[PDB]
Amino acid sequence: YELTQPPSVSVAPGQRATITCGGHNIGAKNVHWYQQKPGQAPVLVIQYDSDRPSGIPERFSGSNSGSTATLTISRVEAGDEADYYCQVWDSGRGHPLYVFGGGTKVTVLGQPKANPTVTLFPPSSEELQANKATLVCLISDFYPGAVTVAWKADSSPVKAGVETTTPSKQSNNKYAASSYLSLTPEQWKSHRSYSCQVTHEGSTVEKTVAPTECS
Amino acid sequence: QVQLVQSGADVKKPGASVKVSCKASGYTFIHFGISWVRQAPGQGLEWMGWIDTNNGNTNYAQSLQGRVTMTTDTSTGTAYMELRSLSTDDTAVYFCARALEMGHRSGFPFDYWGQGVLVTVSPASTKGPSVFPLAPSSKSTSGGTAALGCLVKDYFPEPVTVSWNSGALTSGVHTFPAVLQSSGLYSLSSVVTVPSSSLGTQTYICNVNHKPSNTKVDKRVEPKSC
Ligand SMILES: [Cl-]
Ligand SMILES: [Cl-]
Ligand SMILES: [Cl-]
Ligand SMILES: [Cl-]
Ligand SMILES: [Cl-]
Ligand SMILES: [Cl-]
Incomplete structure (x- = not known):
């Protein structure tokens, strides 16, 4: 199963960051999203398309429909600069798997x-x-x-x-x-x-x- | 708080195996599986497989069929990932991550992660660099600025440091991170931007230091004869 993300996004502080994740009928799947800063492990920021884990700020949101899942960071802050990855599970015709998108480098303009x-x-x-x-x-x-x-x-x-x-x-x-x-x-x-x-x-x-x- | 603690990485020769560990604490070990994920330098996350800490189920990525094996030790709350027949393509940071269950009808997200450990695969023994000049353009006949540098080729292991004119030249210098070639050897470059009117009068020397091989090179960078 293939996941397609744009390589990079630029966003000014206080504006909305939109990160997309394309896949064939991806709206029939659950999409999870991860944030990764340099030298660090990833952090789960959205799970099951739209759910925020405890401790994730409310400016992170997600949605999923048709062939595009979307991570939205409203009123983006300097500390939200990071690489963002989408992820899905697939039943794999009897051999289940996970797959990651290629990642999107989100620069918060500074x-x-x-x-x-x-x-x-x-x-x-x-x-x-x-x-x-x-x-x-x-x-x-x-x-x-x-x-x-x-x-x-x-x-x-x-x-x-x-x-x-x-x-x-x-x-x-x-x-x-x-x-x-x-x-x-x-x-x-x-x-x-x-x-x-x-x-x-x-x-x-x-x-x-x-x-x-x-x- | 949940913690996942990794060790076991090393530099490895092609054909060798590596066994990475992931020691868990702060939750009931046997009630959450463990996924393994790797990341080549500068590249994206790639899923390797998953193990059920309660029942021993193991699911591996198709691209790794046959050469990964995951195990656990319940008594110590530790998960292990062995990767065999290593090649330079396997140089990567290896993460473990907690993932409740993965099955034919479920795939939970990876809610806590280990810190990641770097496995470097290379056939190379310690090797000092070959240094070549990156001469300023033959077109910088007059004023303005000119870039010149040194190419530091084919050394192992990291790191290399570079100064210019024994540290007397610092303005406009940038020494880049290294690339790791498929040969398992590193290379980097250092550049400096100088007044083009200095190219006939000022000498420019890059001072390359590779302590692992106790090598120092002073490479004169001059305009080209053409
Ligand atoms: Cl882009
Ligand atoms: Cl982290
Ligand atoms: Cl966390
Ligand atoms: Cl807010
Ligand atoms: Cl251990
Ligand atoms: Cl993947």
Whole structure:
């Protein structure tokens, strides 16, 4: 059984946060919701679609109908910033299971929006001479701290060989993240260019490098 | 108050097994089952299975068929999860969680959780990094600012620390968290943003420290010959 959540939501304090969880006829299921802050275990915030466990503030509510379950945080507060996960049980045609959604990173806005700076380094001559190649995409000075990174060879997306870090705060309190594409020297020199594309809050910035050009 | 207390994690070689424990207190152990959930770094929650502490029923995720086994010890209120034939894909934080019952017609939520323990799977012995320069753009001929850095490749275990010019350069520095490659080796980068008019006059050296291997590297980062 598949559960689909949006990767991220941005919400100002005092406004309403809406986190959805899609599934085929999910309204025929019971949905449970969890809150998880960095370095911590999850906390159950809504159970059985709409019920608040004891100790959960009344600004958390839930509903479920058709193909969408919804966690709502009314009058959201700074401390509600967290990742939120939905969950269901399924009878599994005789082999019962639980499944989680992919999670939604809910940022409660606490500083000004900042658009990312992207710096893409080609493989160094030193590394190429060691018979290896790494493209290094560094993403800095952004807020909210949520991005998607996509790599391309020429125009074709590349998934294999990629590793990306979760954003964390810089000295100046904005976020930075990093992504790497590991290639052989042959792969590097056999395409016209490679690109790192960063999506932040609905828009994208792309940097490109080329094996034949001194970046 | 309900508490679930975990231990048993370690660094493991591929092919090995790990056994994680989950010691419960503050409620009637045999009246609530225990689920296990794991989370790869930066990724989402994934259900592994569940055990009935009263009757021994065990239900496992299909993707783990054959290589997970869950047990309990009633006398100590402890649940265990053994995961066999480990690979680097199994690097994750492993949680236990209390879940009343799970069956063919019920699946209660996970109302209390253990703290989580990190199992790292890697074939690597201690290994110092290879450091490569991330040279400033050949286009930074004039004024403004320029980014430059050091790529710190293929070390084990964590951590690495990086300074610039022996700590004399701190403004504009950011050293990133590491990635863990499928090889079981870590890499990271450190970057600094400097005046582009300094690129011909000021030397820039990254000072990389990997104490586990007693390695220090001072890597000069210069503009490129092209
Ligand atoms: Cl989103
Ligand atoms: Cl917690
Ligand atoms: Cl709690
Ligand atoms: Cl309220
Ligand atoms: Cl024990
Ligand atoms: Cl799952």
